[PDB]
Design a protein around this ligand. Structure first.
Ligand SMILES: [Mg+2]
Ligand SMILES: [Mg+2]
Ligand SMILES: [Mg+2]
Ligand SMILES: [Mg+2]
Ligand SMILES: [Mg+2]
Ligand SMILES: [Mg+2]
Ligand SMILES: [Mg+2]
Ligand SMILES: [Mg+2]
Ligand SMILES: [Mg+2]
Ligand SMILES: [Mg+2]
Ligand SMILES: [Mg+2]
Ligand SMILES: [Mg+2]
Ligand SMILES: [Mg+2]
Ligand SMILES: [Mg+2]
Ligand SMILES: [Mg+2]
Ligand SMILES: [Mg+2]
Ligand SMILES: [Mg+2]
Ligand SMILES: [Mg+2]
Ligand SMILES: [Mg+2]
Ligand SMILES: [Mg+2]
Ligand SMILES: [Mg+2]
Ligand SMILES: [Mg+2]
Ligand SMILES: [Mg+2]
Ligand SMILES: [Mg+2]
Ligand SMILES: [Mg+2]
Ligand SMILES: [Mg+2]
Ligand SMILES: [Mg+2]
Ligand SMILES: [Mg+2]
Ligand SMILES: [Mg+2]
Ligand SMILES: [Mg+2]
Ligand SMILES: [Mg+2]
Ligand SMILES: [Mg+2]
Ligand SMILES: [Mg+2]
Ligand SMILES: [Mg+2]
Ligand SMILES: [Mg+2]
Ligand SMILES: [Mg+2]
Ligand SMILES: [Mg+2]
Ligand SMILES: [Mg+2]
Ligand SMILES: [Mg+2]
Ligand SMILES: [Mg+2]
Ligand SMILES: [Mg+2]
Ligand SMILES: [Mg+2]
Ligand SMILES: [Mg+2]
Ligand SMILES: [Mg+2]
Ligand SMILES: [Mg+2]
Ligand SMILES: [Mg+2]
Ligand SMILES: [Mg+2]
Ligand SMILES: [Mg+2]
Ligand SMILES: [Mg+2]
Ligand SMILES: [Mg+2]
Ligand SMILES: [Mg+2]
Ligand SMILES: [Mg+2]
Ligand SMILES: [Mg+2]
Ligand SMILES: [Mg+2]
Ligand SMILES: [Mg+2]
Ligand SMILES: [Mg+2]
Ligand SMILES: [Mg+2]
Ligand SMILES: [Mg+2]
Ligand SMILES: [Mg+2]
Ligand SMILES: [Mg+2]
Ligand SMILES: [Mg+2]
Ligand SMILES: [Mg+2]
Ligand SMILES: [Mg+2]
Ligand SMILES: [Mg+2]
Ligand SMILES: [Mg+2]
Lengths: 147, 210
RNA sequence: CAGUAACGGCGAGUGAACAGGGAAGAGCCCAGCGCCGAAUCCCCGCCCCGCGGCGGGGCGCGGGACAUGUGGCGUACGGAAGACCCGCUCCCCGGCGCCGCUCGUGGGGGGCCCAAGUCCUUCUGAUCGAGGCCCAGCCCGUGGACGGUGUGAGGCCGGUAGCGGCCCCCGGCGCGCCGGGCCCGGGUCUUCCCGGAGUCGGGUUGCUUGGGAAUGCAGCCCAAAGCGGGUGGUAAACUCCAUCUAAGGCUAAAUACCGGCACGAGACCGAUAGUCAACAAGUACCGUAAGGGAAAGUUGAAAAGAACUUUGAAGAGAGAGUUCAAGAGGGCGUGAAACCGUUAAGAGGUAAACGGGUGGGGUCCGCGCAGUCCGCCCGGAGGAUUCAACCCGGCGGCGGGUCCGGCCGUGUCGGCGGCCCGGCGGAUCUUUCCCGCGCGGGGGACCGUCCCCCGACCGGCGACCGGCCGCCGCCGGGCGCAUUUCC
RNA sequence: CCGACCCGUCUUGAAACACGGACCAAGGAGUCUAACACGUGCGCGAGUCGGGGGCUCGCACGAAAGCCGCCGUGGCGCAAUGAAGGUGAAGGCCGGCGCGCUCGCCGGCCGAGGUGGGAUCCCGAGGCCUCUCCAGUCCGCCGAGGGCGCACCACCGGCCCGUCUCGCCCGCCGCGCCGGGGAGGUGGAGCACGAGCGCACGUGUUAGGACCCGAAAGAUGGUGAACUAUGCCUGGGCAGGGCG
RNA sequence: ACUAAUCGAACCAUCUAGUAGCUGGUUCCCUCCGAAGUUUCCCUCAGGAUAGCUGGCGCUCUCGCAGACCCGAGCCACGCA
RNA sequence: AGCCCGGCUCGCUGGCGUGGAGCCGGGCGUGGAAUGCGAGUGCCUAGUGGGCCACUUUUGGUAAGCAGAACUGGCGCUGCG
RNA sequence: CUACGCCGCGACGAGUAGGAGGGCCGCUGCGGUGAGCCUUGAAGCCUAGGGCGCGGGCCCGGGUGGAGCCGCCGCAGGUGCAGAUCUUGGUGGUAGUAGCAAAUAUUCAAACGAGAACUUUGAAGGCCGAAGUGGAGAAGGGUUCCAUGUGAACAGCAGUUGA
RNA sequence: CGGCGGGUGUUGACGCGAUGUGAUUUCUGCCCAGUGCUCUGAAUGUCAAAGUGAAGAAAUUCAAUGAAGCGCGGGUAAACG
RNA sequence: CCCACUGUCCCUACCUACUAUCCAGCGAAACCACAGCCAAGGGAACGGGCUUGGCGGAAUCAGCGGGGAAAGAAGACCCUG
RNA sequence: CACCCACUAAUAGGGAACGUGAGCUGGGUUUAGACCGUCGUGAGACAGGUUAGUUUUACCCUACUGAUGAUGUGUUGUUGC
């Protein structure tokens, strides 16, 4: 809605909100990111440090699918199965533990943030972190790998 | 000119973009035209399935998608051969074929040949001359049981084998997943240089006594 | 994917691809190696069947092309020839007659048609306006889009709706026949046969690309191989692996469309706007030329476009006349401002003009011109149902242990009640009863939400309602007909 | 009668001998797209979003609206850190043990620590009542103190990744130039029970013609020797006298 | 000098709405708040970035909200200048 | 966030129960000058970045309605006597 | 007591550049709504008419006009002018002014005609003076040539004349 | 732009092409250090690509060789001066 | 520089033609914030307007060139970009 | 400015946008042509010399010069202050 904007309130004011002294001119200072090392250097250094120069190794023909490896944490681990699964395991008399397949749920690596409920579980994952494996063992479970 | 904090932006509007702007006001008309063409094609091939030939079960290539499975271009010649279908009759009876696809694994091979045999069991074939039914089908199963199929023929569907809960054994409990992964990475990294060092050690060993 | 990998005085800036999901989906042919008595093709005469894009069939000791290679088989998915076994499985082409009539209901094109007020009374210059048309309401409506008509019209007219009608022409679909072609397909074994060169590749140069010790293209020089060659995004040697098979060819669909033909529409513009062009506009005109390029819409319903008389040489006037209107008179709807003429009022030697405060005059306004009203009460003189209170009926408001239902919310039980006789889900267990190798798809059980259900208790009648009573209020009709009530 | 210079504009300063403005009518200048950032509104919420496609008499409206869910592919968010190979965010108490050596093995609990502030909430001795009392029944108000402490702030611990220093253990189908762990500093756009996603609106910045009008120029492709400059071809023309 | 009234590089059309830190203009009303011409850096000195000065949006708290008319019944807020 | 009592931790320091720091309990309000005022905090942000003048201080200059600084006020942005 | 309402008390009020809020200020179009208005007169325009609002502006009376228009709730903008040596169009003062002064020159009578300084005829006085103000061509123009008629406009006065 | 393309040139040193000075008369002095131009390559210094040789597993690296030009050496002022 | 010659001059006058002038007809343009009498003051330091004073009398004609820092042109000098 | 001749009573000094260009003139400076000297490699430069080089408009307002008129005295005239 153009009726809600400043231009409707600036009718009758000669400078249209841009000043009488400095005016509104075409491109004072340059176009785009001009003079980022010469006369906009303070702004670039203050708000975008690291902008100038190269760091690291370049790598031609990067394929993101190769490095595709989504991660899941142990606190969200039990959300990948149904609630029926967890309650049945908790109330189960025998020591049978359910299997959680994070590759089936769409994750490749299990990370160790959080804590687990005190009940065993088998976790199938491509990769495990050290603390995630330690916690899964700590709750009496097992970590088994898949390819 | 930058103004206080902000993102350094790089618009790609330096190249006279307004001469090449594609509007989409013909999108609803295009959808209507495509739907009319689909309906006309489905009418033209009256009992044949509207979506077209059956497609093979095909695993997706890269490591991001190899867990999924989808529909391919056509059945491979090895699949057709072991299913007993001629590669020039398959396209006549509505089987898409792909001469350039290979079968690396017997599992995928057998999956696709069971798919082909299921399609052949579900196929109804009309004789060329209706008054002379030579080898197509019985008239009882094609008088009213013939019907144009809507949607892809036998759609390719991802299936998950559900594992029941089981008792964790001590061997599984004593498996070391992180250590095994780290050692596997180290072995794959150092396999070649270890072999080179063994080579040089053997070369010195065979001449140590001289 | 992705403003990403990358390129870039690594500055400004530039910048793809693979995988994934879809729209569409369709595959193939030579050269070469070979086999087959050149099997091949064009042209010219003759005859027959056709015409409608010139073909079919036959004939020629008729010409020519062609062994410096035509045709059939055959192409990297291998191919061929022999044997052995098995299956005869049914091709395309142009007519004769007619269906299903071609199909989201004609396939297309062209033509002619199809509902209902000009009803009564009125307004008007004319109305399409206004009021009305008992029966639930003028008439039609599968038609109330639009346009025209002297306003503003569903019913006056054209149209509009309709798997509405009729006529003419054209085109693709099945059957029986017609003319003729049309020639064997699969599996196993054996024996054979297999490929595109000044090209690849390399150097260098120039351009290009995101392609970075060089992505692509090209020039020059060098110049291949055959278990070879190319690619494997960092130059090189060795090595393994993967992947394709270049240097010959065709191929629909999805996609693009500011020119063209024909349409439909719009929260667009409305004659200095919108195309330059609403109009005898790429016109008039300008320039030697290339080229530049306007301005310009509107009388009225109908010309009914002012007969006639009169002054003037005429332009132009005065009368008259048409019209609802010429205070609409052929650049004529309306007709602003600037500017000007005349009339009227006022004023005027510090240029006008302006702010504040008064005063004078003037034009208008106030129905100004004997100045409001209205509630109660008192007094006077008149009218009239009826005033209160009772009776009957109607209808409401509120209250009621739920008086009685209807129920309602949360739970609560047996679940009789549902995988046949209620559902939908579950990353929960199973045939240890069922059809695919000791290997699926079903069917069960359980769980969770459910569904209506038979009933009960718990809290409530609630803003979810009814029937009864009780009270109150209003209304209608009786009686009450005068110290009441009202005007 | 008193007051009163002509507006606009740039400017330290305009009535200016500074510029524009004779008058009137109509036109006339911060727009749209994309991308960000923050604020506000709405829906859903560890999710969110069908925008591309498809399905629905295909079409007056309708090019709309509705639907998909084994169309959620995908985008953004839910994890960071390192050039990279890679790695990748839970602690506190009571204990029995080596040797509880600043540390190794388990149990039970609890489940992101602690300090200081901290809206709000909770308890509360004691007070406020009547015609009065010796005698308690029900609830209301004030209330000194005390307690649990939201968000947020400051600080101290802890955890993850990179990198240094120190040092000792542990693991094995590969005993290795293998793998893992500890303590103390330090680098991080981190963790420490999520806040995002989509849509709309506003403001600001930017790229685009970019609020409107404005160069001197540069480039591409064409038209001109009817004027003139010069060469060539073919024509035409230039009284009367002097010197000699 | 001259090259069609154009010549220290003709004319025409297009790229082109070329760029401009420079000049000019920039359209209704009321209400509230209200500046700077200074610091640092810049081939910067007629310009920008940066801090300062401004506005808007808030949020976190603090005093009490008193007696229905009336009627207080040593000690009187976090903090700031 | 002060003062005063105890106690605990330390791998720092060390004759020492030393020193220092931290931590944990407890007790003290006459709230430890005057005066005034309600404070704290975050985000986004325009304009500006030519100034000029006066008292006083002050540099260059013979001086300047000159050029340059300090302090406060003003004009700019402001009418009124 | 339109709670987006109503009421009370206290203090305060300058303002460029700039920022924000409110607008029952205004323009055009769209979705709703007003059983809205209108040929018994819409829009527009004019007005010494009556008023309202701080203001932007608005309402009403009278006239002209002759067919459409507005309020309210939302929505959307090519949405408000005194300026830009602004664009287009129109109109003033200047101003009945500058001016209609290069190349010697006209006069008399008559005719036609409404009308004669300019037309035609006659008479007179002059000029070009054969390198012409004469007679004919090229280029260029294109019907200007000729006759008849007209008197609008044009021939910078006029015209009975005219390219 | 290009073609063994074209102009001088239907030409040939009494000719074409490039310069300076400016009739006649009388004269036109000194300077080759500088910058130009030109002549000679003489052992010659430097000197690209290609080619040659060596080291290496190759990419590559090194070495030898030495075109014009520049350096070295003469001439020239009616060349600039 | 000299001779001659003369209105170049002392030092101006007179005459002629065409204008200008007045009239009949016809009839522009430049320019224009509003306008148009001065002295001084202050002021963007040279006012038509403002302050203080002088004063001010319709409508015009022919001239005139003091002013309107008159008009003509977005200074061509100078500086900046 | 200067200097000299001569006369003279004396041959004083100045202002008025360094009075006065829509008053003139155009000799000088100060465009474009050209020559010399010096400077510069060069283009070119020189408060160095020299030569040739378009001087536009008033009809408006005022000022001034003249020319009619205007207000009031009833009209009108003469003579006057
Ligand atoms: Mg303002
Ligand atoms: Mg400035
Ligand atoms: Mg992204
Ligand atoms: Mg590019
Ligand atoms: Mg598809
Ligand atoms: Mg052959
Ligand atoms: Mg009809
Ligand atoms: Mg009609
Ligand atoms: Mg109609
Ligand atoms: Mg029809
Ligand atoms: Mg590599
Ligand atoms: Mg137009
Ligand atoms: Mg109009
Ligand atoms: Mg006339
Ligand atoms: Mg009329
Ligand atoms: Mg008219
Ligand atoms: Mg008048
Ligand atoms: Mg200005
Ligand atoms: Mg100044
Ligand atoms: Mg001003
Ligand atoms: Mg002045
Ligand atoms: Mg000036
Ligand atoms: Mg200016
Ligand atoms: Mg002007
Ligand atoms: Mg103007
Ligand atoms: Mg306007
Ligand atoms: Mg849709
Ligand atoms: Mg996904
Ligand atoms: Mg910390
Ligand atoms: Mg910002
Ligand atoms: Mg522009
Ligand atoms: Mg331009
Ligand atoms: Mg250039
Ligand atoms: Mg010529
Ligand atoms: Mg710099
Ligand atoms: Mg300026
Ligand atoms: Mg400054
Ligand atoms: Mg000073
Ligand atoms: Mg200022
Ligand atoms: Mg101030
Ligand atoms: Mg003031
Ligand atoms: Mg005040
Ligand atoms: Mg104010
Ligand atoms: Mg506009
Ligand atoms: Mg205007
Ligand atoms: Mg303005
Ligand atoms: Mg005159
Ligand atoms: Mg004259
Ligand atoms: Mg003569
Ligand atoms: Mg002649
Ligand atoms: Mg003639
Ligand atoms: Mg005339
Ligand atoms: Mg010569
Ligand atoms: Mg050499
Ligand atoms: Mg010599
Ligand atoms: Mg004066
Ligand atoms: Mg200028
Ligand atoms: Mg200029
Ligand atoms: Mg002077
Ligand atoms: Mg003068
Ligand atoms: Mg002059
Ligand atoms: Mg001169
Ligand atoms: Mg000169
Ligand atoms: Mg001369
Ligand atoms: Mg005159």
């Amino acid at each position: 809605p153009s009726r809600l904007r400043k231009t409707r309130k600036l009718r009758g004011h000669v400078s249209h909100g841009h000043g009488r002294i400095g005016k509104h001119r075409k491109h004072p200072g340059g176009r785009g990111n001009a003079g980022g090392l010469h006369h906009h250097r303070i702004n670039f250094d203050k708000y975008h440090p690291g902008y100038f120069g190269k760091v690291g190794m370049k790598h031609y023909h990067l394929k993101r699918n190769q490095s595709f490896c989504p991660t899941v944490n142990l606190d969200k681990l039990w959300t990948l199965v149904s609630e029926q699964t967890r309650v049945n395991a908790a109330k189960n008399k025998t020591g049978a533990a359910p299997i959680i397949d994070v590759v089936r749920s769409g994750y490749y690596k299990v990370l160790g943030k959080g804590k687990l409920p005190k009940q065993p579980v088998i976790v199938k994952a491509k990769f495990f972190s050290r603390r995630a494996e330690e916690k899964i063992k700590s709750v009496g479970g097992a970590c088994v790998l898949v390819a | 000119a930058p103004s206080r904090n902000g993102m350094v932006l790089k618009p790609h509007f330096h190249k006279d973009w307004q001469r090449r702007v594609a509007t989409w006001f013909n999108q609803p008309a295009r959808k209507i035209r495509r739907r009319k063409a689909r309906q006309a094609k489905a009418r033209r091939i009256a009992p044949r399935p509207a979506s077209g030939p059956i497609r093979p079960i095909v695993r997706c290539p890269t490591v991001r998608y190899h867990t999924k499975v989808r529909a391919g271009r056509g059945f491979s010649l090895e699949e057709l051969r072991v299913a007993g279908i001629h590669k020039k009759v398959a396209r006549t009876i509505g089987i898409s074929v792909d001469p350039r696809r290979r079968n690396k694994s017997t599992e995928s091979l057998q999956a696709n040949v069971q798919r082909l045999k299921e399609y052949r069991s579900k196929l109804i074939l009309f004789p060329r001359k209706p008054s002379a039914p030579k080898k197509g089908d019985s008239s009882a199963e094609e008088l009213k049981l013939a019907t144009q199929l809507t949607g892809p023929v036998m759609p390719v569907r991802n299936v998950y084998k559900k594992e029941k809960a089981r008792v964790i054994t001590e061997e599984e409990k004593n498996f070391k997943a992180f250590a095994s992964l780290r050692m596997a990475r180290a072995n794959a990294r150092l396999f070649g240089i270890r072999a080179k060092r063994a080579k040089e050690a053997a070369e010195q060993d065979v001449e140590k006594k001289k």
